[PDB]
Point group: C2
Chain length 138, copies 2
């Protein structure tokens, strides 16, 4: 996909899922060096060990996870032009909603940051940087 | 300043300077958790040790530093609402130009990223997020 995708086959309303964000490096020269994803204020959020990357999960006053950021360690050149990388976070409970989005911000080695924060295609509109979105089973 | 500022009293064309970026947290609730600054493709770029933060300096094929990123370690809550933080990088040689800018991207704990990439005030225009800029002595 030329887009960041979100995958979580289980995914149910009020459920816990391992969510995988697959991110493309859309530059011919610069590499992806960090990814920040906005989380739907979940009670639980745990990343899995990713050699060469450090993850932080930020929390609000209620101890909900509000976002997660993965950052390439020094010496790690990050995700190269043309390649994809998976970033995995286990979260829950997912909202009691039909749909949930995960606005994301992708940092490149050349200093640029790409926002993946547009709402879904409708009418027409065909956004080139939509927020990754999941449908949640009842 | 309600803006990111750049300070480097020495700063000369073809010179080496310690450049200090002072960054305000402009949220009432979210904290600054990373800063990425675009560098003018310098041969040399070294950060100074910042407890609780990790820095990476990205390079291109010619071994020039193209950007620098500081990221708050896990457990470090980042720069709190209303506070400022200095991020310091020693770089050179600075371009043979009267002016150099350092476009920056500021990440907040709530997942938002603020771009400091607008060109300087002129006519009209009075940008609220200008790229930090230095004047370089001849």
């Amino acid at each position: 996909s030329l887009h960041v995708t979100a995958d979580a086959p289980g995914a149910a309303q009020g459920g816990y899922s391992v969510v995988t964000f697959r991110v493309p490096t859309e530059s011919e020269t610069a590499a992806t060096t960090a990814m920040t994803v906005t989380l739907p204020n979940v009670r639980s959020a745990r990343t899995e060990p990713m050699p060469g990357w450090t993850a932080r999960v930020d929390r609000n006053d209620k101890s909900e996870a509000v976002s997660v950021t993965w950052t390439a360690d020094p010496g790690n050149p990050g995700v190269q032009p043309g390649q994809f990388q998976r970033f995995v976070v286990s979260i829950g409970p997912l909202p009691s909603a039909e749909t949930v989005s995960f606005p994301a911000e992708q940092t490149y080695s050349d200093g640029r940051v790409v926002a993946w924060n547009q709402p879904p295609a409708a009418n027409g509109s065909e956004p080139e940087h939509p927020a990754p979105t999941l449908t949640l089973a009842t």
